[PDB]
Design an enzyme around this catalytic site. Structure first.
Site, PDB file in Angstrom:
ATOM      1  N   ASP A  51       0.835  -1.188   0.000  1.00 55.37           N
ATOM      2  CA  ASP A  51       0.000   0.000   0.000  1.00 55.37           C
ATOM      3  C   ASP A  51       0.880   1.253   0.000  1.00 55.37           C
ATOM      4  O   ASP A  51       2.110   1.195   0.119  1.00 55.37           O
ATOM      5  CB  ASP A  51      -1.021  -0.054   1.133  1.00 55.37           C
ATOM      6  CG  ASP A  51      -0.385  -0.107   2.493  1.00 55.37           C
ATOM      7  OD1 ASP A  51       0.762   0.350   2.626  1.00 55.37           O
ATOM      8  OD2 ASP A  51      -1.043  -0.604   3.446  1.00 55.37           O
ATOM      9  N   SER A  52       0.245   2.401  -0.195  1.00 53.98           N
ATOM     10  CA  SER A  52       1.019   3.618  -0.373  1.00 53.98           C
ATOM     11  C   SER A  52       1.443   4.253   0.944  1.00 53.98           C
ATOM     12  O   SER A  52       2.325   5.120   0.940  1.00 53.98           O
ATOM     13  CB  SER A  52       0.187   4.630  -1.151  1.00 53.98           C
ATOM     14  OG  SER A  52      -0.771   5.224  -0.304  1.00 53.98           O
ATOM     15  N   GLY A  53       0.840   3.844   2.055  1.00 51.47           N
ATOM     16  CA  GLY A  53       1.073   4.458   3.343  1.00 51.47           C
ATOM     17  C   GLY A  53       0.136   5.596   3.682  1.00 51.47           C
ATOM     18  O   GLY A  53       0.069   5.989   4.855  1.00 51.47           O
ATOM     19  N   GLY A  54      -0.633   6.096   2.716  1.00 55.55           N
ATOM     20  CA  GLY A  54      -1.427   7.294   2.958  1.00 55.55           C
ATOM     21  C   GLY A  54      -2.594   7.069   3.905  1.00 55.55           C
ATOM     22  O   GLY A  54      -2.943   7.955   4.690  1.00 55.55           O
ATOM     23  N   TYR A  55      -3.229   5.899   3.830  1.00 55.56           N
ATOM     24  CA  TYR A  55      -4.380   5.626   4.689  1.00 55.56           C
ATOM     25  C   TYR A  55      -3.970   5.563   6.158  1.00 55.56           C
ATOM     26  O   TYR A  55      -4.555   6.247   7.012  1.00 55.56           O
ATOM     27  CB  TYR A  55      -5.047   4.317   4.262  1.00 55.56           C
ATOM     28  N   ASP A  89      -2.712   8.134  -2.520  1.00 53.63           N
ATOM     29  CA  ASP A  89      -3.960   8.874  -2.627  1.00 53.63           C
ATOM     30  C   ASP A  89      -4.498   9.293  -1.271  1.00 53.63           C
ATOM     31  O   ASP A  89      -4.019   8.865  -0.211  1.00 53.63           O
ATOM     32  CB  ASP A  89      -5.019   8.125  -3.443  1.00 53.63           C
ATOM     33  CG  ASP A  89      -5.622   6.967  -2.706  1.00 53.63           C
ATOM     34  OD1 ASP A  89      -5.018   6.462  -1.734  1.00 53.63           O
ATOM     35  OD2 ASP A  89      -6.724   6.559  -3.125  1.00 53.63           O
ATOM     36  N   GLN A 133     -11.495   6.888  -6.722  1.00 50.85           N
ATOM     37  CA  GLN A 133     -12.152   7.487  -5.559  1.00 50.85           C
ATOM     38  C   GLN A 133     -13.494   8.074  -5.980  1.00 50.85           C
ATOM     39  O   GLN A 133     -13.996   7.745  -7.055  1.00 50.85           O
ATOM     40  CB  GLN A 133     -11.218   8.515  -4.916  1.00 50.85           C
ATOM     41  CG  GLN A 133      -9.984   7.884  -4.248  1.00 50.85           C
ATOM     42  CD  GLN A 133     -10.301   7.054  -3.003  1.00 50.85           C
ATOM     43  OE1 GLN A 133     -11.411   7.064  -2.498  1.00 50.85           O
ATOM     44  NE2 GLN A 133      -9.315   6.310  -2.528  1.00 50.85           N
ATOM     45  N   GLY A 188     -11.842   3.568  -1.106  1.00 53.36           N
ATOM     46  CA  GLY A 188     -12.827   4.299  -0.333  1.00 53.36           C
ATOM     47  C   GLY A 188     -14.093   3.549   0.032  1.00 53.36           C
ATOM     48  O   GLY A 188     -15.065   4.180   0.457  1.00 53.36           O
ATOM     49  N   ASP A 218      -7.903  -7.766  -0.091  1.00 49.60           N
ATOM     50  CA  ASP A 218      -7.086  -7.927   1.104  1.00 49.60           C
ATOM     51  C   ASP A 218      -7.918  -7.491   2.301  1.00 49.60           C
ATOM     52  O   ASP A 218      -8.796  -6.635   2.173  1.00 49.60           O
ATOM     53  CB  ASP A 218      -5.845  -7.023   1.088  1.00 49.60           C
ATOM     54  CG  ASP A 218      -6.186  -5.564   1.407  1.00 49.60           C
ATOM     55  OD1 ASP A 218      -6.612  -4.830   0.483  1.00 49.60           O
ATOM     56  OD2 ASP A 218      -6.072  -5.156   2.592  1.00 49.60           O
ATOM     57  N   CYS A 250     -12.775 -28.521   6.228  1.00 46.97           N
ATOM     58  CA  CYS A 250     -11.518 -27.836   5.968  1.00 46.97           C
ATOM     59  C   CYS A 250     -10.350 -28.809   5.869  1.00 46.97           C
ATOM     60  O   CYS A 250     -10.179 -29.693   6.712  1.00 46.97           O
ATOM     61  CB  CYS A 250     -11.259 -26.846   7.103  1.00 46.97           C
ATOM     62  SG  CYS A 250      -9.752 -25.883   6.881  1.00 46.97           S
ATOM     63  N   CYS A 291      -7.160 -27.889   6.092  1.00 45.31           N
ATOM     64  CA  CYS A 291      -5.938 -27.279   6.579  1.00 45.31           C
ATOM     65  C   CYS A 291      -5.265 -28.161   7.631  1.00 45.31           C
ATOM     66  O   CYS A 291      -5.867 -29.069   8.209  1.00 45.31           O
ATOM     67  CB  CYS A 291      -6.205 -25.869   7.103  1.00 45.31           C
ATOM     68  SG  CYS A 291      -6.657 -25.688   8.846  1.00 45.31           S
ATOM     69  N   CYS A 300      -7.013 -28.320  11.094  1.00 39.24           N
ATOM     70  CA  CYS A 300      -8.204 -29.156  11.192  1.00 39.24           C
ATOM     71  C   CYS A 300      -7.896 -30.639  11.029  1.00 39.24           C
ATOM     72  O   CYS A 300      -8.717 -31.473  11.428  1.00 39.24           O
ATOM     73  CB  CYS A 300      -9.255 -28.671  10.201  1.00 39.24           C
ATOM     74  SG  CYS A 300      -9.889 -27.033  10.626  1.00 39.24           S
ATOM     75  N   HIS A 305      -5.747 -21.570  10.219  1.00 34.23           N
ATOM     76  CA  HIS A 305      -7.050 -22.032   9.757  1.00 34.23           C
ATOM     77  C   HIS A 305      -7.797 -20.932   8.994  1.00 34.23           C
ATOM     78  O   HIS A 305      -8.372 -21.182   7.933  1.00 34.23           O
ATOM     79  CB  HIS A 305      -7.934 -22.532  10.898  1.00 34.23           C
ATOM     80  CG  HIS A 305      -9.350 -22.695  10.463  1.00 34.23           C
ATOM     81  ND1 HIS A 305      -9.761 -23.765   9.698  1.00 34.23           N
ATOM     82  CD2 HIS A 305     -10.411 -21.857  10.548  1.00 34.23           C
ATOM     83  CE1 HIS A 305     -11.033 -23.604   9.374  1.00 34.23           C
ATOM     84  NE2 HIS A 305     -11.454 -22.457   9.888  1.00 34.23           N
TER      85      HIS A 305
HETATM   86 ZN   LIG Z   1      -8.948 -25.602   9.023  1.00 31.94          ZN
END
Ligand SMILES: [Zn+2]
Ligand SMILES: [Cl-]
Ligand SMILES: [Cl-]
Ligand SMILES: [Zn+2]
Lengths: 365, 365
Positions: A92-96, A138, A185, A212, A262, A300, A302, A305, A331
């Site tokens: 990310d740009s760091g602005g947020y 931004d 935006q 946004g 994300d 699941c 994973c 699990c 998980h």
């Molecule tokens: Zn799992």
């Protein structure tokens, strides 16, 4: 592999599935990016992140520029080497976070000063980290915003998008090996979203984020804005919905043409005791799990699990044990990747609409 | 495999190397047992504990009898299944931590009441957990102690050792599948250590611990007491020094006939930033490591040192990140296991005296 190539293999309605090829690897889309805050996906080794199916992670620039510092990371060989992740990283740009986590911020047309970060400095920091996908710098617009203030903020962000493009292009090694995404935006206003899309397409980017919309507006309103906003972006480039979201937000956003996501929800809420399951989220701290020998989720695949019970993880989280955070986070990230895999496969097979209906019926039962 | 068989393969002076065979696995001696507090070796999956070379772990009974509770663990299938560790577990009796961590304790010949734990209840709790090596319940003697008070405490502990033996033997499944160790007491006094050894040998145990020496007396005094105390125990059974210790404490204790060790130092101090190296401990928080690309230790074969730099781990620990605790703990437990392996190999080859000298010269340089 090329610097950047997005190819769409299959479509259903507005939904798409395909791949982004980059020098450091292939990204399957729609994609979910686990969030690395401070050069770590919290409580996971990078091999474990990869074992869950993640193709790319997000690195937060704001923390890294403060600790350990961008120049220091560059001196140590870049973020990939530093944290032991050799696949693509989007920064990310760091602005947020400058606005949310700093004190004494002062904004201007040049950038933001805080206790300076300009478009040019943000792009340079992302270069020093060695980012593969660089985000334009931004001004994220608060919600709600008046039309006048949303317009002013969007217009500044578009001027900043051009400055970001020119800064990126000026640095040969970055221009030749990384990609640059611009950010739409305009708050919830269709005319401003259109002006922003037009401005970004005129400048030209490798991908387009919808900015946004992770701001507390609620799912109905988010979806209403996506309905008109995503079609404004170039069809042949990736569409990235920043900061989203819950599983059902992701499904509906894909139905509306989003390719990348994300969120901190699977990691942060995992450490807090929330586990995602195909039958909806559960809070493992609840006393009802104290003697439950089933895994977090019945289906699941994973590693958590396969081996550990709800009763054990309940005990660990109640006791404040680090292993509890480790197991919940692995998980949850695995669940998110399995969701993305089911989305990709269903689009490829032309049954995504049915998958979304079945997913919602069971998740909200 | 048998319930319990200790075999000595090689000797050098008072030092011995060999194996304990038990139903759930073989333990190589001299052995170091990572400590599991609350059914987890803090910050490590059990597969990672095993990857470092550990053959057996210690489970703290005091925490488990409170949370999640011994009867609950038994209902869920026992501690091995609950925490995902299928190899031997040694459980402490709970008596030490009842005194250190409880409030409102009331002691009597029957046991200890706290905000009751008797010899019989301690053995039953260790049965419910499914312990492989059960510790007799005893009264740890404060340091310093007067001869009169050390004698009174040791005599009660020996009466409690007989009660522990009889409780263990009364329970057929426990007697047939687990082992029972007795604990020598007597503070720093040779005559009391001898009376305690004689009492324990008359009752008969599968192994013998040297109790009461992890109490702040300093290494010189610990070694002085071991010099006369260990030869009092039966030669053909394992000798377990409870709660020790630093690497150089372990080396000197092996030189004095000790076969088994446990300590929280590698785990607890790892989370705090202390890493063990062949050139002595380092504190990774120190600013001198901020740009150090070397691994924690130049020779260490562990997975952390194959991949991650001091600079990265420095950043993680300074930032309070869970991955920092994970990486430091895995390295430290691996270091301890590598130390035990070098000890075992050097005894087998008749060069342990030289190894101890070389180890100390470099560790304290
Ligand atoms: Zn799992
Ligand atoms: Cl997080
Ligand atoms: Cl610990
Ligand atoms: Zn190591």
């Amino acid at each position: 592999r090329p610097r950047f190539s997005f190819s769409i293999a299959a479509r259903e309605g507005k939904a798409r599935t395909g791949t982004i090829e980059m020098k450091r690897g292939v990204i399957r889309t729609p994609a979910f990016m686990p969030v690395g805050t401070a050069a770590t996906v919290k409580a996971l080794k990078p091999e474990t992140v990869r074992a869950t199916g993640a193709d790319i992670i997000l690195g937060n620039t704001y923390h890294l520029m403060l600790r350990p510092g961008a120049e220091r990371i560059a001196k140590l060989g870049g973020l990939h080497s530093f944290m032991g992740w050799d696949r693509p990283i989007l920064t990310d740009s760091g602005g947020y976070q400058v606005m949310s986590l700093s004190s004494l911020t002062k904004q201007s047309e040049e950038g933001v000063t805080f206790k300076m970060l300009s478009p040019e400095r943000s792009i340079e920091i992302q270069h020093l980290l060695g980012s593969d996908i660089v985000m334009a710098f931004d001004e994220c617009t608060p919600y709600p915003a008046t039309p006048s203030r949303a317009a002013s903020s969007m217009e500044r962000s578009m001027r900043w998008a051009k400055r970001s493009r020119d800064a990126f292009d000026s640095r040969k090694e970055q221009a030749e090996n990384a990609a640059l995404f611009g950010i739409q935006q305009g708050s919830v206003f269709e005319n401003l979203r259109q002006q922003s899309a037009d401005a970004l397409a005129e400048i030209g980017f490798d991908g387009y984020a919808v900015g946004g919309l992770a701001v507390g507006e609620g799912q109905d309103e988010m979806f209403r804005v996506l309905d008109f906003s995503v079609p404004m972006l170039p069809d042949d480039k990736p569409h990235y919905l920043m900061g989203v979201g819950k599983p059902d937000d992701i499904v509906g956003a894909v139905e509306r043409g989003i390719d990348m996501f994300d969120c901190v929800l699977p990691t942060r809420s995992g450490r807090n005791g929330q586990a995602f399951t195909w039958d909806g989220p559960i809070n493992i701290r609840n006393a009802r799990f104290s003697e439950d020998l089933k895994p977090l989720d019945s289906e699941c695949h994973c590693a958590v699990c396969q081996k550990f019970s709800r009763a054990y993880i309940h005990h660990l989280i109640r006791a404040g044990e680090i292993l509890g955070a480790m197991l919940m986070t692995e998980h949850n990230i695995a669940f998110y990747q399995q969701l993305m895999q089911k989305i990709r496969d269903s689009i490829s097979e032309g049954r995504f609409s049915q998958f979304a209906q079945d997913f919602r019926a069971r998740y909200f039962a």
